[PDB]
Design a binder for this molecule. Structure first.
Ligand SMILES: CCCCCCCCCCCCCCCCCC(=O)OC[C@H](COP(=O)([O-])OCC(O)COP(=O)([O-])OC[C@@H](COC(=O)CCCCCCCCCCCCCCCCC)OC(=O)CCCCCCCCCCCCCCCCC)OC(=O)CCCCCCCCCCCCCCCCC
Ligand SMILES: CCCCCCCCCCCCCCCCCC(=O)OC[C@H](COP(=O)([O-])OCC(O)COP(=O)([O-])OC[C@@H](COC(=O)CCCCCCCCCCCCCCCCC)OC(=O)CCCCCCCCCCCCCCCCC)OC(=O)CCCCCCCCCCCCCCCCC
Lengths: 110, 31, 66
């Protein structure tokens, strides 16, 4: 893993509406195949930078588990930011519709 | 003559393809 | 029975006594073009075959995704 700060900056630019007009102008004379190939090439460049530079270089986060800890932290961040938020919303939904625990209720006795 | 063009690094260092893995058999999956 | 529809094989013990048994090649190579590849040494694959093989250096994550 690397360039997390650059990734945050990329997301900020993407959410900026001025950049939406800039992308609208850049999309003139452009194809979906070209866009897809560009994105795939970017991702490959990132992973190739990792595969090459891990052989000789160590980041500030280097640890006896290597990049495994960074990838676990990425996963945990994603989980807590997205999935637990969705769980909160689903909890409030179920509690308003059936009551707390309403989705695990037993069938009506016959 | 002097160099003035801004030379990018993609014209020099080409990255390997690692996103999709290699096929040492050189045959498709259905085959 | 007549013997026309008999079993089309001989037991492995009798083959072993005959000196006939072969054990190998769980796999096979159907075509002679494919059989003689490792013996040709100069054209294991024709040129057309070579360029056709060059299209499958990597798996297609795009096709997988689609
Ligand atoms: C709250 C933490 C828990 C999070 C929520 C719970 C989730 C748990 C799961 C954890 C999974 C973690 C994810 C791992 C994936 C890998 C991420 C990674 O390694 O790269 C991170 C990434 C660095 O990416 P990079 O590719 O390595 O680039 C490095 C640069 O070149 C720069 O080069 P450099 O050499 O100059 O510096 C390298 C690096 C060096 O980093 C370090 O070595 C650590 C710093 C000091 C040593 C001790 C660290 C722990 C205690 C002090 C720090 C407290 C914050 C905890 C930070 C967690 C990471 C240690 O510097 C930093 O990255 C800065 C990190 C510290 C940010 C401090 C912000 C202060 C505001 C928060 C208030 C104070 C804390 C409140 C109490 C919170 C208690 C939980 O750091 C960033 O977040 C980028 C910041 C960009 C500025 C954004 C605007 C300012 C906002 C600041 C907040 C930033 C977001 C994080 C929130 C933390 C504060 C709330
Ligand atoms: C919900 C599933 C529903 C079905 C049940 C599932 C049953 C199958 C299970 C398979 C499980 C395998 C595991 C996944 C494989 C991963 C690796 C891989 O596929 O390598 C890349 C590989 C790419 O191949 P490549 O080696 O790069 O070759 C590219 C060549 O350049 C391309 O050029 P070309 O010359 O080869 O030909 C171009 C083109 C077309 O071919 C041509 O050359 C032109 C001729 C095409 C015309 C005919 C089209 C074929 C038939 C019609 C198909 C569509 C509609 C049928 C409508 C019926 C009639 C109206 O090629 C193809 O269309 C490829 C054929 C795709 C067939 C799938 C591959 C065979 C796998 C064997 C599966 C076993 C099924 C049993 C067979 C049935 C009983 C005998 O991916 C695939 O192509 C296969 C797609 C995989 C299917 C998706 C299933 C999902 C997998 C889930 C895994 C994740 C698990 C956890 C889920 C939870 C996630 C959070």
């Amino acid at each position: 893993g690397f360039h997390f700060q650059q990734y945050i900056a990329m997301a900020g630019r993407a959410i900026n509406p001025v950049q939406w007009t800039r992308a609208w102008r850049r999309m003139e004379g452009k194809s979906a195949t070209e866009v897809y190939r560009d994105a795939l090439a970017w991702t490959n460049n990132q992973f190739a930078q990792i595969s090459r530079a891990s052989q000789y270089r160590a980041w500030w986060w280097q640890n006896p588990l290597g990049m495994g800890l960074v990838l676990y932290g990425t996963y945990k961040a994603w989980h807590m930011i997205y999935m637990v938020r969705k769980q909160k919303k689903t909890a409030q939904l179920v509690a308003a519709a059936y009551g707390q625990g309403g989705q695990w209720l037993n069938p009506v006795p016959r | 003559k002097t160099l003035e063009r801004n030379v990018p690094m993609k014209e020099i260092l080409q990255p390997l393809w690692v996103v999709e893995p290699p096929n040492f058999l050189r045959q498709p999956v259905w085959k | 029975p007549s013997g026309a529809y008999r079993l089309p094989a001989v037991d492995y013990k009798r083959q072993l006594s005959r000196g006939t048994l072969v054990e190998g090649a769980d796999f096979y190579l159907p075509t002679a073009q494919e059989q003689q590849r490792l013996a040709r040494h100069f054209e294991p694959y024709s040129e057309q075959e070579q360029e056709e093989r060059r299209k499958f250096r990597f798996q297609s994550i795009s096709v997988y995704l689609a």
